[PDB]
Amino acid sequence: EVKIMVEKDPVKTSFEKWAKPGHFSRTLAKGPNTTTWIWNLHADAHDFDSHTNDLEEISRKVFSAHFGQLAVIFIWLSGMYFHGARFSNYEAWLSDPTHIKPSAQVVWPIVGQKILNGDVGGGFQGIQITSGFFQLWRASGITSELQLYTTAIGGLIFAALMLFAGWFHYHKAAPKLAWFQNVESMLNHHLAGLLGLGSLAWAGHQVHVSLPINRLLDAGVDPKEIPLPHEFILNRDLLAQLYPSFSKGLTPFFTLNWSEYSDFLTFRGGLNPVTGGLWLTDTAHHHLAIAVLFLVAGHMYRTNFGIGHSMKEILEAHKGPFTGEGHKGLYEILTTSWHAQLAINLAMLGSLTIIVAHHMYAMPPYPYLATDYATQLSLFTHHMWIGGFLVVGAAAHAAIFMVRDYDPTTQYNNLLDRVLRHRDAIISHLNWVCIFLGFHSFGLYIHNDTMSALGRPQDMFSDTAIQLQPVFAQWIQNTHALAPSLTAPNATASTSLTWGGGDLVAVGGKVALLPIPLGTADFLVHHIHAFTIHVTVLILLKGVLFARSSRLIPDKANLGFRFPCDGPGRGGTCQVSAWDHVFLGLFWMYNAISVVIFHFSWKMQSDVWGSISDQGVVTHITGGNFAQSSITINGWLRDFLWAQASQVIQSYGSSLSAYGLLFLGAHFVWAFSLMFLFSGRGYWQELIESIVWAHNKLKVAPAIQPRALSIVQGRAVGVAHYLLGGIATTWAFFLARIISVG
């Protein structure tokens, strides 16, 4: 039954719908009458469910919007490869990366901003980049900037292809609703065709291109005299001199002599002592294994060839005595609602990005990634912020599924109906564990601050005071260090250096990684992390569960998603909406992720990042003060927020002064947020009425009536400036401090 359903020319490619701005909504198609029409024009621009009730045109809109997003990402990748090709020192950094900072952005000498073109090394001036593209291209085997320019113009070609496909799948041949409802085929071609063949193709690149070029880069060979990537494919003796297993020539693959591929497909583990990044024989065995495993997992579901699984048959057979008729109708949830699938996909992508952040500081995949501390801090911080934003958006589209796509007739006595039936128990027990975590982590911090203030260092929670050692983490770290000897034999070393297997890797005189200690301070800050994640889950899950109704408002689903309130009744119904719970969970994501990256920055500037002198002595950036100062808020304000901010505020008159400017302007955007968050619409409406009177006096009244921003819009503007200003504050402080001390 799975086959291609498209139909030809649904909408004509015309600019007459470009001229009318609010064509998608019936309310905005009448033209503007107030200034709130402009904000509802942008608010309802992407909301395709509010435009039409037909899921087919909604799915076509979403598919072509995906293609436009892919075009934007390919334009971005084209820019970052063109910046590597023309405006970088990638060949100079590739000659020796332990002394030259990665830089790929040149500013124009116009208004004094030419001081931002700093001395990054290699006879080059520019903004020192922290995005990690240089180490990524070193891991890709890129030797020259002509390859970067070729990848940039190839990405521009693919961006034109995504734009052409977005036009094609909305105006020339757009698919019908049952094409998008073939989720078994989509999972079969995403697991096997996308993630399986993608891992297999990158495994082939990391067998032929990344591995020999990166082996020659470990030998001190100059990249201008390293042979080009196709010379290893053509001259296979040149490939065989670096790995003798290539001399057999694909006969051990089909005769199952895979151990004869042990020269280039290894389960080593740990870091390259030359570079400080993971081995590419392990990253090529990794990709070959996750490819021979994603291609196996892509042959699971039933499309039209008889073999496979109907996943409705998987779900409807999963029913239990504590649930009864559970998992039934969830296929009808996840094939008739885009928001439910968006909630699941956003939760997995955000949690996965958090997995990426941890599995990159800890197991650095790229050569000279760990020893360039700016790249490590910026990559962890960026992926934590993206992951937190995507899990808050997961709860957002979960709540939009409840208020606009949850049909109660098709969901009786399943899992979702019963989760709604005891949502008071879920939110109340979550409330209890959040308050318990809040006292038992932050009140422990307050206790340490109080007894450190009262001159009682023995009455604290220190490593010298009452100890709170994380015995489960300290045991799982010993279990992961003492693994190769008995539970994981075939490993040369251990998975990560941060486990406890020794191997003090020194690359360029700077510490790549070592055994990470876990003490009372790590216990306290991990309980802060669990507390903040739990409270973010509490607001977000409360907005998902009470999106339909509440004890307060039993008709909340009729009010919608982006409604402000019901009114001042029932004591006041301000921020009853599920949107307002996403709005507050954005703040709790700020709190959670900001303490996560603060613990990260202080923990590895104190216990990981540093330098190694002669006779094996390790001097960290802030030597050993995480175990004693990160247990009090005064240490966090003092030895982290004051001592490490002594490079973002005196960076003026240097190349890092734009970080000082954006540090201060980020404080500005944050205090600007507090204008929108703390205020309300009616005050600003009457102030605008006075300004409209002054305009009426001088005959400069606009016909589009000036209005204050809406209450949902005022909260949106406030949380957008709060996240933008606070995140830009942490970005500026991080990227000034760890560039300055790195």
Binding site: G567, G569, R570
Partner: protein, 80 residues
């Protein structure tokens, strides 16, 4: 509890009653409009005070008007 007052600017459009979630408002006969009906609030002790009627009133300025006064267990919207 809450005092809901109807003024003579009402056109009898009935949407204040339709927006009422606690059945406060009802349409009584009247002689001051084309629709020949005005709203009234007999069950104003059941008023939560949500002002959904004021949001649905098209008359400028409003004909239905809710004044938040003494608040009891009806007008607090509690179930415990």
């Amino acid at each position: 509890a809450h005092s809901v007052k109807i003024y003579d600017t009402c056109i009898g459009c009935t949407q204040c009653v339709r927006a009422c979630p606690t059945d406060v408002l009802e349409m009584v006969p009247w002689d001051g409009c084309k629709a020949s009906q005005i709203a009234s609030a007999p069950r104003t002790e059941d008023c939560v005070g949500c002002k959904r009627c004021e949001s649905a009133c098209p008359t400028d300025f409003l004909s239905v008007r809710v004044y938040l006064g003494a608040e009891t267990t009806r007008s607090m919207g509690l179930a415990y």
